[PDB]
Structure 1
Amino acid sequence: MNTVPFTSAPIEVTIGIDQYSFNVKENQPFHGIKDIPIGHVHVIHFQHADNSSMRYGYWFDCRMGNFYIQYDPKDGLYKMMEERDGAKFENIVHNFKERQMMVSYPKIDEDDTWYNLTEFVQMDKIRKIVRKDENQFSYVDSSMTTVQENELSDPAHSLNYTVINFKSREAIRPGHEMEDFLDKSYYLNTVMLQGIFKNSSNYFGELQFAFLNAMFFGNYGSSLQWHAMIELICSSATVPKHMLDKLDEILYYQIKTLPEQYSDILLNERVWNICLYSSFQKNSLHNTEKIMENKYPELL
């Protein structure tokens, strides 16, 4: 079990860790989050009581070091930092627990939600999508733009997702125009799976990180990336059996975990009606299809 201490909480903010979150009042003695399950990535995120705009947060992994939160009053926000002095860090943590000013990561033992949402997410890959390599954790917020969005401005703050575009030379072999555009198996399997992602686990990991950023920060370009990555599988007539079964699990927990009230901007009506009902893989998402219909029959 690991801990993320907070120096203080000077401003009224809603703090989220993974799918959980807490209201914290201006200068409430709040001093961290304990009992964080080792073995997965995590994200801590913030929304100030005064600015319900710009949700932000830090993807991290406690195996990679000791991290803590400190409010910066110049830049106006909660900053994740690393403490390099191992001894000095366990000293802050043990004293805050003793004083019992920390919340416990509130995991039900029956619950594999976080694992299913993050199965294939690896911190090494996150830090290639969010390049800032003087930190072991990664910053994301509501406003950050993707490399594909930028192409149609500041690259230091960009989400360097893999560019997917169905009407590109990359996607379409000369001479197989009609073939490759109606059946994307070429683009998925040779260009993306074998060529760029190397394996399906890196693909699923990006897909899931994209979803998660859409969900926790309303990052619009992230939602576009997740949709595009589902769409390419469902529009491929030839997909490994193991990917299809897994995709149906992955989406199922993403749909399960979405707030009910956000289904209008985070869910692309066209993509889902194509994937579930028109695509090659209509019949291969039995759990994703059942959950969508019994929960959002309107969008379909």
Structure 2
Amino acid sequence: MNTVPFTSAPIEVTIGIDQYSFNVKENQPFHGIKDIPIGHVHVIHFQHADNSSMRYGYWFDCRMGNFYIQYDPKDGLYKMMEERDGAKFENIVHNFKERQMMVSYPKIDEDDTWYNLTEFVQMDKIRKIVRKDENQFSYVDSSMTTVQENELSDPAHSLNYTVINFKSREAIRPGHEMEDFLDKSYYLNTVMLQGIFKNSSNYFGELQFAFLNAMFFGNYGSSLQWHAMIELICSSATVPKHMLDKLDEILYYQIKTLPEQYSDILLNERVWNICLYSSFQKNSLHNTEKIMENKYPELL
């Protein structure tokens, strides 16, 4: 079980860790988060009390280094940093634990939610979507645009999700125009799975990461990517049976976790109705269709 210490909390802020969150008052004696489960990526995220604008945060994996948070009064945000002196870090953390100045990652033993939301998400893939190679952790915020969004402006601060475009030469084989547009299996299985992602695990990892950035930061380009990656599978007549079963599990837990009061914006009516009721895979997402109908029958 690992720890992310905070130097201090100089401004009032709502701090999230994965799907949890808590309020820290201005200059409250807060020195970080302990008992963070090893084996998963994690995200620590922030919304200032004064400016609820810009949610921002950091994706990290405590197996890759010792990380801490320190507020920067010049840039005006809580920054993640790596401590390279391992003895210094253990000593800092042990002292904060002795003074009981840390919150505990509050995981229920029965509860597999975070595993289920991050099953295929790997730090190494995150760091290719979010390019900043001098750090082992990755910054994301509400405003960052995607590579594809920029094509339709600062490249260093972009989300390099795989570009998916259903009316593109990449998606449409010359002479199979109608076939490839109406049944996207070629584009899913040959172009994307075999060609670009290499396997379905990396596909699902990017889909899961996009969903989580949409949910935690309200990142619009991330929501677009998540729905595009769903629609590409649902609009393929030929999908490996194991991918469909796993997709149903993935989407189930994403819909289960979504705040009820944010569905209006984070869920695209056209994509979900098409996917659950019109697409080739309309009968292959039993768990997802059941939770969607019981929780958001309005959208449908």
TM-score between both structures, scaled by the size of structure 1? 1.00
Q: In the TM superposition, what is the alpha-carbon distance from 1:76 to its structure 2 partner?
A: 0.1
Q: In the TM superposition, what is the alpha-carbon distance from 1:203 to its structure 2 partner?
A: 0.1
Q: Which residue of 2 aligns with 1:276?
A: 276
Q: In the TM superposition, what is the alpha-carbon distance from 1:87 to its structure 2 partner?
A: 0.3
| Secondary structure of the corresponding residue to residue 139 of structure 1 | strand
Q: In the TM superposition, what is the alpha-carbon distance from 1:186 to its structure 2 partner?
A: 0.1
Counterpart CA distance in 2 for 1:147 and 1:13 is 30
Q: In the TM superposition, what is the alpha-carbon distance from 1:242 to its structure 2 partner?
A: 0.2
Q: Deviations over 1:27-80 (max 9, x none)?
A: 000001000000000000000000111000000000000000000000000000
Q: In the TM superposition, what is the alpha-carbon distance from 1:249 to its structure 2 partner?
A: 0.1
Counterpart CA distance in 2 for 1:233 and 1:224 is 15
Q: Deviations over 1:124-153 (max 9, x none)?
A: 000000000000000000000000000011
| Secondary structure of the corresponding residue to residue 205 of structure 2 | helix
Q: In the TM superposition, what is the alpha-carbon distance from 1:179 to its structure 2 partner?
A: 0.1
| Secondary structure of the corresponding residue to residue 115 of structure 1 | helix
What are the within-5 Å matches in structure 2 for residues 1-300 of structure 1?
Answer: 1-300=1-300
Q: In the TM superposition, what is the alpha-carbon distance from 1:261 to its structure 2 partner?
A: 0.3
Counterpart CA distance in 1 for 2:154 and 2:213 is 19
Counterpart CA distance in 2 for 1:278 and 1:8 is 53
Counterpart CA distance in 1 for 2:42 and 2:36 is 9
| Secondary structure of the corresponding residue to residue 120 of structure 1 | coil
Counterpart CA distance in 2 for 1:192 and 1:84 is 39
Counterpart CA distance in 2 for 1:253 and 1:236 is 22
Q: In the TM superposition, what is the alpha-carbon distance from 1:96 to its structure 2 partner?
A: 0.1
Counterpart CA distance in 2 for 1:184 and 1:51 is 43
Counterpart CA distance in 2 for 1:294 and 1:149 is 33
Counterpart CA distance in 1 for 2:146 and 2:264 is 21
Counterpart CA distance in 1 for 2:112 and 2:198 is 27
Q: In the TM superposition, what is the alpha-carbon distance from 1:167 to its structure 2 partner?
A: 0.0
| Secondary structure of the corresponding residue to residue 225 of structure 2 | helix
Counterpart CA distance in 1 for 2:298 and 2:153 is 37
Q: In the TM superposition, what is the alpha-carbon distance from 1:296 to its structure 2 partner?
A: 0.4
Alignment root-mean-square deviation, CA = 0.2
Q: In the TM superposition, what is the alpha-carbon distance from 1:117 to its structure 2 partner?
A: 0.1
| Secondary structure of the corresponding residue to residue 265 of structure 2 | coil
Counterpart CA distance in 1 for 2:193 and 2:141 is 28
**Structure 1 unmatched ranges of 5 or more:** none
Counterpart CA distance in 1 for 2:295 and 2:231 is 21
| Secondary structure of the corresponding residue to residue 136 of structure 1 | coil
| Secondary structure of the corresponding residue to residue 263 of structure 1 | helix
Percent identity over paired residues: 100
| Secondary structure of the corresponding residue to residue 160 of structure 1 | coil
Q: Deviations over 1:190-213 (max 9, x none)?
A: 000000000000000000000000
Q: In the TM superposition, what is the alpha-carbon distance from 1:115 to its structure 2 partner?
A: 0.1
Q: In the TM superposition, what is the alpha-carbon distance from 1:282 to its structure 2 partner?
A: 0.3
Which aligned segments of 4 or more residues in structure 1 are displaced greater than 4 angstroms?
Answer: none
Aligned length: 300
Q: In the TM superposition, what is the alpha-carbon distance from 1:252 to its structure 2 partner?
A: 0.2
Q: In the TM superposition, what is the alpha-carbon distance from 1:121 to its structure 2 partner?
A: 0.1
